[PDB]
Design a binder for these strands. Structure first.
Ligand SMILES: Nc1nc2c(ncn2[C@@H]2O[C@H](COP(=O)(O)OP(=O)(O)OP(=O)(O)O)[C@@H](O)[C@H]2O)c(=O)[nH]1
Lengths: 70, 71, 221, 850, 83, 77
RNA sequence: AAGCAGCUUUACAGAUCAAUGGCGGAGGGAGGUCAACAUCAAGAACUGUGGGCGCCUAUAGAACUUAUAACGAACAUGGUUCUUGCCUUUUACCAGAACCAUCCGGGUGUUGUCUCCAUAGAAACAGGUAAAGCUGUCCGUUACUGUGGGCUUGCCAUAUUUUUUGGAAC
């Protein structure tokens, strides 16, 4: 997962929402910190800009690689 | 890690708790499990009244049930 | 490998051999190592002794840089009636605090004041042993595994055979303070310089003390 | 716009841009204001934090990089470098981290260690809500550190102590490990002994074990968090840290207050920390670098470079310590755990000015502490208590010399307050100033344009409403830990350079706050510094740096304070309205208590120590000393109408004694009689009250058989055992120089002898002490006690033998002091007695008959 | 394990937006953050999932109920992430 | 100041009838005396009687070992 | 801190045996009381003169630092001007000041030589500066496996409220 650092991630939480952003760091609990992360629900429609955020490893369901690193 | 409620000590605090429950009471005790001892336990019933459940017999509420608390 | 090579430009030594050279060089090195012991014998202090025309009783006396001509003519200030004569304010104070005690100094270098007092204890006894010259000291997770012993366990003795020699050498002057250094010509080694920079001990023949003063004179010049 | 202006400032490991974003938050800014005695490693520890934060300092050479000559970063002054001390506060703004990687920014201020500079230490206490008192092991807890503990407790400021120079006890002393731990038990024992309401130790994150020359600071919690966090689980590690320090032992997983029959007694600080440390040192200077290298690759996870392996023993040891004890996040952790913003900050800002209710959030209210010259330009060190300060804003300024006047003006409640614009704002970085657009709450900043309004300390505020002007509280003038009695009269050698010199003196009053500059009407200038070295720094800074003039300098002098011995035998009416005032000395404890409402006042006075309900009830006022009123004719409210005026004329009477026109000290004035004529005109009434008050108090002392009072430097000396007698001989060389207690410092040859020497007798007494002791002794002169003793001899002695060019005999001393002070102030013009003070003639005949 | 918590620690004094499990969002300056993710805010404005908005002074919400917390972008470059 | 475990212990000494609200269930509220509890705060209740909120009737439940995780609100009645 | 797995390598058997990708290499390393040649405190905003792209590399021209203690933990000798006694002239001078200079020496950096220690090679080709794999091509292992080393890593211990042993389902 450390190999997965800085990659843009599309993550899906237990509430069904999708959060997109570069993973800045994680932990054992899988608490993620996302750069310039944006929220989206229905799909692009109903999208919002969170920015720098930290999502908890308990409510997270799964995450996938989105785009290239920088 | 012991949570610091010291700034809420002996103050009237309004808990919100799982199941759209709302409590109001003066803080007494707490612990690392965050379980709370309240005085003057006050339920907020669904609409108009606020039921006063406990006066001098205080109360204790398990921690994880707490959504949050306000001063 | 202890030296740069046949050109013999650089040298690097181990601890024990340098300690040997030190214990051999004790007669020629008087162990003046304390810097605070030099008070008013700093080169700064002698320069200020020259610019102020004030001779430390141990230091050399010089020609004054500025010929003494008095323009005071006793104004209201520093009159005999105004000032209070109590403390002798002898020359040593003038070289001690150049600006405060002295009026109109020129080209005066600020002295070093002092380092903290030197508590150094030289052994004459195991390493890290309590000196009888010291003042006595008045006094007034319970489980853990079987493992976890304090750091550097199995290292046996705390004091190695050389560590005393290490500590005694740690405070050595510029020559012996180091395990490596450049080569200096025998022309460039001053052995007798560290002898006249010291306070002359009492009960020397007056001629010897005068020799100290002359040597210091050439040195400061 | 200022991007092209900097280019000098060194790049910092953390970006400087984020630091100000951290500065926007009042919670994240802690002001350290590090304190400590002389040569305690303060500037060197601050240097460790600066080198720690920045990348590569341009002003450090290869030699100071090896660590031979200790780098002092925070002293950029020519004199501070050459003379080797610290003088003016120069701190740093350092974003720092705890054991938790949370990064709190800190404003450090290094107060000079030498005692004559304690003014800067007072500015540091008033500046900093935290205090790191850096204590030397070998010097133990000195009396100066005691004064810093009691002093910081007085103004309510948190303290986090740093025990420093362990490598001295380890190398110089070569203490056995158990005995050295006993030394630490002695240091901390005295520490908690002089701290009344707190318990400091390595646990609780208060004491910080450090050696600056070899560049490492660590706390037991930081250390365990480093090298014991691998073996110990996270569950028991906290309690394990809490139990490390004392009165416990260890074998295998077993803890007892007793050694439990084991062959070795190692009370768990020795064994777990202090022994690994000793083995680090002894192996570092001693052990072969190969197997040592193997230890560091094994135990501490340290990898040595070949260049590192090739270092000399001292630089190699410094480098090994910087690898074992990593970049310093522990000391900052102890800073955080030490300082709690609540229960303190409000108490602090209430102690500095007035107890009040919060502050209006809109208005900007900030204390102006010290005027510093930095790049050769006038700056102002300002701490913002509330509101935000923008570059280019117009702000009101008031020198704290006028404060209580304004506060009384509000208690009776355009503006007389001169306003100035902020030209620039900066964050002190030590050798560089980092400019910032706007300054925020709870931080220490510099401003260029403020320096012109105020003499030394000021209040700086901008209000958005007038109700705020009603609700503003202003800062009391800074209380300097030590009063400055050291007196030197100056004149320029070329009088035509006098005007420029005047400007210089003004700048001096701004740059050195504790200096008290007096301008005598005879043209001879007077300067009052704390002591010898402080006034010397004043002179070198005054001439070379600011105004370059040949300056004649009189022998060092003192301020004398007139007083009375017995009770005034006669009550003399005084007219140009006839007032007779009786005088009497204060009680012993009444003085000490004074230097440091009416019902509570009479209860504290009477209760605490002897008084009568009429006297203690009728006390009108206290100053600097206390005016009292005890006729039977007090019945009319007249004395209540003129009471304020009597307290005024009493102020002018006490500010100038009858003898030397010097401040009256320890004298209670009780009013026996006040006459009022038939006709009353308030202007001529009061304007004739003032002179009769001044003359009244003069007659008060002179009828009491007045005595002079000389100040007394309290003397702290560190000598060795064999050189103790010589010092005692020096004490017999001076009229003063009482020795009281000779304190044995544990585990060191140094005996610290306390003493008292009068400031007249002491001139370069430090220097003579050192030359007599051959550099093995050290002397310090500290007068914060405001203790005054009578110079032996009786003033008003017509026949006393005074040698013109030689010191005078003991019994004749006070006489020549009075004479020569009167002449230096031009009062003589040629025993004041009562004649010019109007004993009149016939009554003067009557007193001559008695 | 350091960065996620230690970040939320360094978020004190910064305006943050909590979204909770029930969906009610609490914005405001973060007064305190305990290592267990229990957080305490002052000057909090709350938005219910239905859109209802209120303003409140002192709030303290447990960790276990936090859906996530958004901290200002200033921390993007911080000494935390430097290895 | 009184810790919640010793407060629950105080209710244990007092023995007064205790009303308990469960977790994420608003329909039932159980009543009865506390005969003991553990460090996990799993409480064995005496004379347990249901109190449906959905006029309040109930079925006597006897003694019960009640798991602390469902335990939410402990009071007296 | 053992083992397992992952990562990096590695003596390697290897897939490919192509296009690749990585790391190194396209001119060695020590030494010499061996030479010659340049300089000799580090700064540097700011500008100028050039390159590389308002920024770095190279130079000098002022600001504003201390050289400092010490190109050298040493320290000589002259010259010029000023002053002091010899003095009264040339020397030679005693003692200082200021500014120059001579000598004794040293670090570097560039090359050239002159002796020990080495084994792949792709150390092959073409471009230029004041410099070099500096650039382009290029080749050595090789980019995906299993045995062998090291860690920068997780387990070797957590099912009891704040995370992973769910309060969901409908
Ligand atoms: N032997 C030894 N000397 C030390 C140690 N730490 C500091 N010193 C010396 O103590 C001196 C004083 O420290 P500084 O920081 O330079 O100055 P200071 O302590 O602030 O003293 P002031 O500047 O006058 O306030 C330093 O110059 C060091 O030479 C140490 O650990 N061991």
């Amino acid at each position: 997962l450390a190999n997965l650092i800085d990659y843009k991630l599309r993550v899906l939480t237990q509430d069904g929402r999708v959060y997109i952003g570069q993973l800045m760091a994680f932990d054992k609990h899988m608490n993620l910190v996302l750069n310039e992360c944006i929220e989206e629900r229905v799909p692009k429609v109903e999208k919002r800009v969170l920015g720098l955020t930290i999502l908890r490893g308990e409510q997270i369901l799964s995450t996938v690689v989105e785009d290239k690193p920088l | 890690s012991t949570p610091e409620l010291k700034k809420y000590m002996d103050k009237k605090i309004l808990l919100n708790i799982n199941g759209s429950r709302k409590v109001a009471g003066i803080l007494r005790g707490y612990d690392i499990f965050l379980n709370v001892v309240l005085d003057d336990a006050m339920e907020i019933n669904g609409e108009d009244p606020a039921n006063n459940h406990q006066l001098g017999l205080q109360t204790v509420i398990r921690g994880n049930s707490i959504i949050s608390l306000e001063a | 490998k202890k030296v740069n090579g046949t050109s013999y430009k650089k040298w690097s030594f181990d601890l024990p051999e340098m300690s040997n050279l030190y214990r051999l060089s004790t007669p020629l090195r008087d162990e003046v190592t304390d810097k605070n012991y030099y008070y008013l014998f700093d080169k700064k202090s002698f320069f200020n002794g020259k610019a102020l025309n004030n001779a430390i009783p141990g230091g050399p006396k010089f020609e004054p840089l500025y010929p003494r001509e008095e323009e005071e003519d006793y104004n209201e200030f520093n009159s005999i009636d105004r000032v209070i004569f109590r403390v002798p304010i002898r020359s040593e104070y003038k070289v001690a605090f150049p600006h405060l005690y002295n009026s109109r100094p020129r080209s005066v270098r600020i002295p070093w004041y002092n380092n903290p007092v030197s508590c150094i204890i030289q052994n004459d006894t195991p390493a890290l042993f309590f000196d009888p010259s010291l003042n006595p000291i008045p006094h007034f997770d319970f489980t853990l595994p079987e493992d976890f012993a304090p750091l550097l366990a199995e290292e046996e003795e705390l004091i190695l055979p050389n560590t005393k020699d290490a500590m005694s050498l740690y405070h050595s002057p510029f020559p012996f303070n180091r395990t490596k250094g450049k080569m200096v010509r025998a022309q460039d080694v001053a052995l007798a310089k560290k002898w006249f920079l010291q306070h002359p001990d009492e009960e020397y023949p007056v001629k010897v003390k005068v020799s100290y003063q002359k040597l210091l004179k050439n040195y400061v010049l | 716009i200022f991007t092209q202006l900097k280019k000098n400032i060194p790049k910092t490991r953390y970006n400087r841009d984020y630091m100000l974003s951290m500065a926007n938050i009042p919670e994240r800014i802690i002001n350290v204001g590090v304190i400590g005695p002389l040569h305690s490693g303060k500037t060197s520890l601050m240097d460790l934090l600066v080198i720690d934060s920045h990348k590569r300092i341009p002003d450090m050479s290869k030699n100071v990089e090896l660590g031979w000559k200790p780098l002092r970063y925070l002293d950029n002054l020519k004199q501070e470098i050459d003379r080797g001390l610290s003088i003016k506060l120069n701190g740093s703004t350092l974003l720092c981290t705890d054991l938790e990687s949370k990064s709190r920014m800190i404003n450090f201020l290094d107060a000079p260690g030498h005692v004559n500079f304690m003014d800067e230490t007072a500015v540091a206490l008033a500046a900093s809500d935290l205090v790191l008192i850096v204590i030397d092991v070998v010097e133990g807890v000195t009396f100066v550190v005691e004064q810093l503990i009691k002093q910081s407790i007085k103004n309510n400021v948190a303290m986090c102590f740093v025990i420093n120079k362990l490598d001295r006890l380890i190398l110089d002393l070569k203490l056995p490990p158990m005995d050295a731990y006993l030394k630490l038990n002695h240091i901390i024992a005295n520490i908690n002994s002089f701290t009344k309401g707190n318990v400091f130790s390595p646990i609780d994150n208060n004491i910080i074990f450090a050696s600056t020359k070899l560049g490492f600071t660590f706390t037991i919690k930081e250390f365990v968090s480093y090298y014991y966090a691998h073996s110990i689980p996270s569950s028991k590690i906290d309690d394990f840290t809490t139990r490390l320090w004392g009165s416990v032992y260890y074998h295998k997983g077993n803890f007892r207050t007793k050694p439990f029959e084991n062959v070795e007694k190692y009370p768990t600080f020795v064994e777990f920390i202090l022994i690994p440390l000793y083995k680090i040192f002894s192996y570092a200077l001693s052990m072969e670098k190969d197997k040592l290298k193997n230890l560091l690759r094994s135990n501490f996870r340290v990898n040595l470079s070949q260049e590192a392996l090739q270092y000399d023993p001292q630089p190699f040891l410094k480098h090994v310590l910087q690898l074992i004890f990593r970049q310093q996040t522990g000391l900052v952790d102890a800073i955080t755990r030490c300082y709690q913003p609540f229960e303190l900050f409000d108490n602090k800002t209430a102690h500095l000015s007035i107890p009040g209710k919060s502050t209006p959030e809109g208005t900007l209210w900030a204390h102006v502490l010290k005027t510093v010259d930095y790049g050769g330009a006038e700056w102002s060190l300002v701490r913002i208590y509330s509101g935000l300060l923008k570059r280019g804003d117009t702000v009101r300024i008031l020198d704290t010399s006028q404060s209580e006047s304004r506060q009384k003006r509000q208690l009776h409640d355009d503006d007389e307050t001169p306003s100035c614009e902020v030209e620039e704002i900066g964050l002190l970085g030590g050798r560089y100033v980092y400019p910032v657009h706007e300054a925020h709450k709870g931080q220490i900043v510099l401003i260029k344009g403020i320096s012109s309004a105020y003499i030394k300390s000021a209040t700086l505020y901008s209000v958005k409403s007038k109700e705020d002007m009603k609700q503003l509280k202003f800062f009391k003038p800074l209380d300097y830990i030590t009063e400055a009695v050291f007196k030197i009269v100056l004149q320029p050698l070329l009088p035509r350079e006098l005007p420029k010199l005047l400007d210089a003196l003004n700048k001096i009053s701004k740059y050195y706050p504790g200096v008290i500059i007096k301008v005598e009407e005879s043209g001879e200038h007077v300067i009052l510094g704390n002591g010898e070295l402080y006034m010397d720094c004043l002179l070198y800074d005054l001439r070379a740096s600011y105004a370059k003039i040949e300056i004649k300098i009189s022998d060092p002098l003192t301020v004398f304070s007139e007083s009375c011995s017995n009770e005034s035998f006669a009550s003399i009416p005084v007219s140009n309205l006839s007032i007779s005032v009786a005088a009497e000395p204060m009680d012993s404890k009444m003085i000490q208590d004074l230097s440091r409402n009416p019902r509570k006042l009479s209860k504290i006075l009477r209760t605490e120590y002897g008084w009568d309900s009429l006297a203690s009830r009728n006390v009108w006022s206290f100053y600097n000393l206390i005016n009292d009123t005890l006729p039977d004719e007090i019945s009319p409210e007249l004395l209540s109408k003129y009471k304020e005026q009597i307290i005024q004329g009493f102020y002018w009477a006490v500010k100038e004694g009858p003898l030397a026109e010097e401040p009256i000290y320890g004298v209670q004035y009780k009013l026996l009689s006040i006459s009022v004529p038939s006709d009353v005109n308030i202007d001529v009434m009061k304007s004739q009250i003032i002179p009769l008050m001044k003359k009244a108090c003069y007659v008060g002392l002179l009828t009491a058989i007045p005595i002079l009072l000389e100040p007394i430097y309290e003397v702290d000396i560190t000598v060795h055992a064999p050189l103790l007698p010589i010092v005692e001989e020096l004490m017999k060389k001076r009229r003063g120089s009482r020795i009281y207690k000779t304190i044995k410092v544990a585990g060191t040859p140094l005996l610290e002898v306390r003493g008292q020497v009068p400031v007249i007798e002491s001139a370069g007494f430090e220097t003579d002490l050192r030359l007599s002791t051959n550099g093995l002794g050290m002397c310090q002169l500290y007068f914060w006690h405001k203790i005054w003793r009578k110079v032996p001899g009786d003033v008003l002695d017509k026949d006393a033998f005074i040698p013109k060019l030689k010191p005078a005999p003991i019994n004749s001393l006070s006489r020549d002091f009075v004479m020569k002070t009167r002449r230096r102030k031009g009062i003589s013009t040629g025993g004041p007695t009562l004649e010019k003070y109007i004993s009149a003639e016939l009554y003067a005949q009557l007193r001559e008959n008695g | 394990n350091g960065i996620p918590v230690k970040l939320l620690n360094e978020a004190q004094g910064h305006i943050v937006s909590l979204e909770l499990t029930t969906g009610a969002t609490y914005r405001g300056k973060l007064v305190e953050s305990e290592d267990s993710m229990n957080v305490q805010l002052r000057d909090v404005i709350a938005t219910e999932p239905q859109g209802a908005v209120t303003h409140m002074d002192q709030i303290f919400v447990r960790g276990s109920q936090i859906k996530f917390i958004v901290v200002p972008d200033l921390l993007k470059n911080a000494p935390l992430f430097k290895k | 100041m009184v810790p919640p475990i010793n407060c629950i212990f105080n209710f244990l000494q007092q023995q007064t009838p205790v009303t308990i609200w469960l977790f994420e269930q608003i329909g039932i509220r159980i009543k009865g005396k506390i005969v003991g509890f553990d460090e996990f705060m799993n409480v064995v209740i005496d004379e347990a009687v249901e109190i449906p909120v959905n006029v309040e009737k109930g079925t006597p439940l006897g003694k019960i070992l009640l798991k602390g995780d469902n335990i939410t609100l402990i009071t007296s009645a």
